[PDB]
Amino acid sequence: PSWPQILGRLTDNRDLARGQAAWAMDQIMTGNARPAQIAAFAVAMTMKAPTADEVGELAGVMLSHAHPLPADTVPDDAVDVVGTGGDGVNTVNLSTMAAIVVAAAGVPVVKHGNRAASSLSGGADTLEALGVRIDLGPDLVARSLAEVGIGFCFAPRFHPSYRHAAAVRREIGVPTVFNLLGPLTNPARPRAGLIGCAFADLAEVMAGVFAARRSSVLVVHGDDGLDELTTTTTSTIWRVAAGSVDKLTFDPAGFGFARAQLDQLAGGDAQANAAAVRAVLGGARGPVRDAVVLNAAGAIVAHAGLSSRAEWLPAWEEGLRRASAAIDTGAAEQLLARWVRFGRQI
Amino acid sequence: PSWPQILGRLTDNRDLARGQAAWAMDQIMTGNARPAQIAAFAVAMTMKAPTADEVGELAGVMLSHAHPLPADTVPDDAVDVVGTGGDGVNTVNLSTMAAIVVAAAGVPVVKHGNRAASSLSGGADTLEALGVRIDLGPDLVARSLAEVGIGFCFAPRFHPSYRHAAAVRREIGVPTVFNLLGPLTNPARPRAGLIGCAFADLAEVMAGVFAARRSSVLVVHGDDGLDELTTTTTSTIWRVAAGSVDKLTFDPAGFGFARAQLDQLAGGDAQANAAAVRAVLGGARGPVRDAVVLNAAGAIVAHAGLSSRAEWLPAWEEGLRRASAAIDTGAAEQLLARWVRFGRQILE
Ligand SMILES: O=P(O)(O)OC[C@H]1O[C@H](OP(=O)(O)OP(=O)(O)O)[C@H](O)[C@@H]1O
Ligand SMILES: O=P(O)(O)OC[C@H]1O[C@H](OP(=O)(O)OP(=O)(O)O)[C@H](O)[C@@H]1O
Ligand SMILES: COc1ccc(C(=O)CC(=O)C(F)(F)F)cc1
Ligand SMILES: COc1ccc(C(=O)CC(=O)C(F)(F)F)cc1
Ligand SMILES: [Mg+2]
Ligand SMILES: [Mg+2]
Ligand SMILES: [Mg+2]
Ligand SMILES: [Mg+2]
Numbered sequence: 001p002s003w004p005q006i007l008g009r010l011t012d013n014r015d016l017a018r019g020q021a022a023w024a025m026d027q028i029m030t031g032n033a034r035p036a037q038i039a040a041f042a043v044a045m046t047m048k049a050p051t052a053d054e055v056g057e058l059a060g061v062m063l064s065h066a067h068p069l070p071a072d073t074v075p076d077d078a079v080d081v082v083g084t085g086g087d088g089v090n091t092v093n094l095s096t097m098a099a100i101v102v103a104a105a106g107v108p109v110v111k112h113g114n115r116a117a118s119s120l121s122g123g124a125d126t127l128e129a130l131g132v133r134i135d136l137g138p139d140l141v142a143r144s145l146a147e148v149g150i151g152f153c154f155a156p157r158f159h160p161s162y163r164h165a166a167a168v169r170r171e172i173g174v175p176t177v178f179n180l181l182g183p184l185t186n187p188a189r190p191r192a193g194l195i196g197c198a199f200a201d202l203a204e205v206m207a208g209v210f211a212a213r214r215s216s217v218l219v220v221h222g223d224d225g226l227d228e229l230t231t232t233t234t235s236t237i238w239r240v241a242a243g244s245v246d247k248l249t250f251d252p253a254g255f256g257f258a259r260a261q262l263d264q265l266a267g268g269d270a271q272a273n274a275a276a277v278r279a280v281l282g283g284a285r286g287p288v289r290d291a292v293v294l295n296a297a298g299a300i301v302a303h304a305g306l307s308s309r310a311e312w313l314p315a316w317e318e319g320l321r322r323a324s325a326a327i328d329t330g331a332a333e334q335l336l337a338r339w340v341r342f343g344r345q346i
Numbered sequence: 347p348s349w350p351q352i353l354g355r356l357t358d359n360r361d362l363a364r365g366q367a368a369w370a371m372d373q374i375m376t377g378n379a380r381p382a383q384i385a386a387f388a389v390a391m392t393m394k395a396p397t398a399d400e401v402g403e404l405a406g407v408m409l410s411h412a413h414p415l416p417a418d419t420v421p422d423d424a425v426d427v428v429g430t431g432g433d434g435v436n437t438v439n440l441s442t443m444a445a446i447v448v449a450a451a452g453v454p455v456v457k458h459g460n461r462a463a464s465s466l467s468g469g470a471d472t473l474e475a476l477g478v479r480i481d482l483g484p485d486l487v488a489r490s491l492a493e494v495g496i497g498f499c500f501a502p503r504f505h506p507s508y509r510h511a512a513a514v515r516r517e518i519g520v521p522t523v524f525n526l527l528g529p530l531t532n533p534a535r536p537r538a539g540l541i542g543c544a545f546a547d548l549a550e551v552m553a554g555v556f557a558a559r560r561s562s563v564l565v566v567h568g569d570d571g572l573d574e575l576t577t578t579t580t581s582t583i584w585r586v587a588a589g590s591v592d593k594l595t596f597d598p599a600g601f602g603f604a605r606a607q608l609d610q611l612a613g614g615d616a617q618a619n620a621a622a623v624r625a626v627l628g629g630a631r632g633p634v635r636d637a638v639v640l641n642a643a644g645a646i647v648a649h650a651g652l653s654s655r656a657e658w659l660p661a662w663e664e665g666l667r668r669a670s671a672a673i674d675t676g677a678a679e680q681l682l683a684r685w686v687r688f689g690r691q692i693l694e
Contacts, residue, residue, distance in 0.1 A: 002519075003517075003519050003520075004519030004520055007389070007518055007519065008519075008520045011389065011392055011520050011521075011522075013393075034381065034517045035380065035381045035382040036381040036385035036514045036517040036518055037517060037518060039382035039385040039386045040385040040386070040388070040389045040520070043353070043386045043389045043390050044389050044393065046357055047357055047359075047389075047390065047393040047394070048393070168382045171349075171382040171383055172349055172350075172382055172383060172386045173348065173349050173350030173353065174349070174350055174353035174354045174356075174386065175354070175357075176357075
């Protein structure tokens with residue numbers, strides 16, 4: 001294997017041979033690729049159209065270099081709630097808010113997240129502005145999870161060897177195959193998740209990667225472009241369980257949700273998005289609560305897919321009830337306060 | 347204009363807006379593009395599939411940073427004989443040999459060239475092995491052209507500001523749109539040329555670049571992969587004249603050339619390729635001479651097209667006779683000797 005062979009195959013629009021993506025990703029993670037090579041590869045793979053097998057190789061090699069959490073500190077039913085970002089739409093931090101509501105509903109949450117890449121405020125930025133400790137290592141993440149029912153893996157802390165790819169990603173700006181990797185490389189490896197994909201074409205690919213794992217996942221793409229379950233129109237959901245994928249069109253109007261407009265979900269800077277978290281957790285009704293409740297239910301539905309005691313619709317109805325109740329009973333607000341407390345208590 | 351905007355347009359499979367390729371190239375030439383940006387751009391522009399307008403912006407910006415030759419030192423009717431390289435075939439240096447023969451036939455040649463990127467021996471490497479000085483600046487290329495009838499612009503000498511692009515090219519290894527730029531960027535700007543393209547899909551784009559310039563050019567791709575007119579089979583010629591392009595299949599059998607095989611055109615290291623130049627110019631008959639003659643004729647035809655009007659077949663017959671005579675009179679062998687002599691005079 002070599003760069004000329006691999007890049008030549010991609011620029012020729014051919015799928016890679018098994019092991020080539022892994023070789024490439026290992027060169028990148030070991031600091032052995034020149035920046036030009038990283039970029040050539042990220043771009044060529046994007047334009048060829050990565051397959052699930054290739055992305056699984058990239059994510060899998062990327063995980064082999066991640067700091068793991070300690071043994072037996074992640075419950076087998078932990079859920080993640082996270083997206084690719086890059087939806088260009090600059091919303092309030094839907095995934096982050098859903099994650100808190102889900103945790104407050106009794107579901108263990110280990111969230112992967114990062115600073116904003118192109119928006120004004122990303123999940124980690126908002127959390128930080130809320131006073132949640134984002135900079136914790138493996139041991140303290142595990143303690144957060146055990147003591148608060150929620151943990152945050154700050155991607156730059158857990159994936160230090162990814163620094164070369166991350167710098168190239170930043171230098172080129174254009175979204176690539178690398179943009180898929182964050183959501184696929186949660187260092188705690190939870191088995192469930194609600195995973196948002198901004199890129200209509202690549203969500204099936206992400207589902208394919210989850211399919212090869214023992215996962216229960218909803219890969220979601222709003223039909224308006226959100227890497228979240230949207231309230232402005234239908235969403236496409238790739239349901240992943242038992243090694244297979246069930247693609248479906250999801251309409252929240254079936255659950256009595258009013259259609260929103262994108263600008264009603266718009267956010268601002270970190271302090272502004274932190275303010276929107278406090279509003280929603282405090283009971284404020286309206287389009288943002290609706291989106292949060294919708295996505296939190298999505299996460300609960302994925303969790304339920306693990307110990308599969310329920311069908312699609314009933315699971316949605318119970319997820320929605322649990323997500324609403326976690327807010328209305330103050331449980332989400334209480335859980336955030338406890339999370340901040342835990343962080344201040346070292 | 348930004349990288350995110352330009353790269354995002356390309357990854358979306360869209361042709362660029364006018365001026366965007368020029369912005370990227372200026373970033374590249376001024377030292378302002380990061381290696382990662384250069385490579386992303388090269389690759390994205392390649393996989394999207396460049397247009398002549400885009401490659402023309404790239405080349406025009408590149409030319410603007412190049413060292414020019416001093417004024418009124420390049421003849422109105424100079425020709426170039428050069429290809430993209432990258433045919434992966436490792437032949438004897440066909441362009442270099444044809445350039446010598448063309449000049450010996452009385453056509454001023456200002457040749458753009460470079461070392462091997464992928465071959466064992468490039469044009470420049472072989473010229474060096476023959477004792478030709480490849481490292482001259484504008485003033486001396488210009489003198490060489492006046493006194494010998496041929497001059498050689500060593501790409502690295504004339505395009506110093508391309509060093510970031512060139513380092514990226516070497517690092518990534520795979521052909522991109524950058525591989526088209528050398529031939530489109532001769533710093534003497536001859537208005538005619540026989541330009542070889544190893545990439546069948548990009549030959550048309552090179553042709554359209556020359557057409558916008560109103561150059562008289564044959565852009566050629568041997569149907570066997572050669573960035574030269576071939577003797578093993580037919581060639582595709584994009585004929586550039588009066589600002590328009592014609593695609594043609596060309597068959598040398600129609601002039602009485604017999605089908606050669608590729609390994610008959612095989613070369614080796616600089617010294618072996620130098621020995622093959624010497625053999626051809628000494629009059630040795632055979633497969634290498636046939637290909638040198640065919641290619642020299644092609645450039646002579648391109649050169650004749652600098653005016654109007656004539657047509658095709660007679661111009662080829664005349665080109666072929668002219669190229670044959672240049673050798674058999676001893677003129678091509680003598681020209682290389684003068685060229686070598688001129689280089690040796692520099693020291694004084
Ligand atoms: O700047 P962007 O590329 O458009 O992405 C914005 C955020 O979305 C992703 O995380 P996450 O899904 O956790 O954030 P969320 O809470 O805002 O949904 C990503 O890690 C960013 O934090
Ligand atoms: O290493 P490669 O990518 O295969 O390219 C071989 C040669 O072709 C180009 O020049 P030119 O057409 O003058 O050389 P030639 O005399 O060998 O044809 C290039 O500048 C190299 O000298
Ligand atoms: C300083 O070194 C680093 C800087 C940034 C990052 C990331 O940004 C990780 C990331 O996106 C992931 F996809 F989630 F893993 C990692 C290391
Ligand atoms: C060290 O500085 C340099 C080294 C190499 C080169 C080239 O290689 C030029 C080239 O191909 C061109 F496209 F014809 F211009 C340029 C500058
Ligand atoms: Mg999100
Ligand atoms: Mg979002
Ligand atoms: Mg050549
Ligand atoms: Mg050649």
